[PDB]
Write a protein that binds this ligand. Structure first.
Ligand SMILES: Cn1cc(-c2cc(NS(=O)(=O)CC(F)(F)F)c3ccn(C(C)(c4ccccn4)c4ccccn4)c3c2)cc(NC(=O)Nc2ccccc2F)c1=O
Length: 113
């Protein structure tokens, strides 16, 4: 099915996002932001739907995403939360932009038929 194939591409993109070659900028997105350990007392107030790569991985496996668009929405939610909460000069934002570039360039090759 077109959907099965799209999901495989999504699985491949997320696997690449976890790969050692991208770890220097991907690592802060591997798991949910630990608001307690980082002392981000206002994070929950500011961000309504936290998202991270391990959460996306778990959702893909459980077959939560019906298609590439649903999967893409959660990847873009992860980056948007970073752009929303952090000051634009924060290092983590620079890292988000590098990981988003890897994501967008490969997600743009999604099979179209
Ligand atoms: C998506 N996301 C993720 C994180 C984040 C998560 C971590 N680990 S984790 O367990 O949570 C998730 C996991 F496992 F995947 F890695 C660590 C461990 C160390 N750090 C540093 C040293 C740091 C600095 C620069 C670049 C990268 N890492 C750190 C320490 C203190 C304060 C900031 N940064 C982390 C940062 C923070 C956000 N935002 C943010 O830290 N904002 C902020 C902090 C202080 C002042 C102003 C701010 F805007 C955010 O969005």
């Amino acid at each position: 099915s077109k959907v099965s194939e799209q999901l495989k591409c999504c699985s491949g993109i997320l696997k690449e996002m976890f790969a050692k070659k991208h770890a220097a900028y991907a690592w802060p997105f591997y798991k949910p932001v630990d608001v307690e350990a980082l002392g981000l007392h206002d994070y929950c107030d500011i961000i309504k739907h936290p998202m991270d790569m391990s959460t996306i991985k778990s959702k893909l496996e459980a077959r939560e995403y019906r298609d590439a668009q649903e999967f893409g929405a959660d990847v873009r939610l992860m980056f948007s939360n970073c752009y929303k909460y952090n000051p634009p000069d924060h290092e983590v934002v620079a890292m988000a932009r590098k990981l988003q570039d890897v994501f967008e360039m490969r997600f743009a090759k999604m099979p179209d038929e």
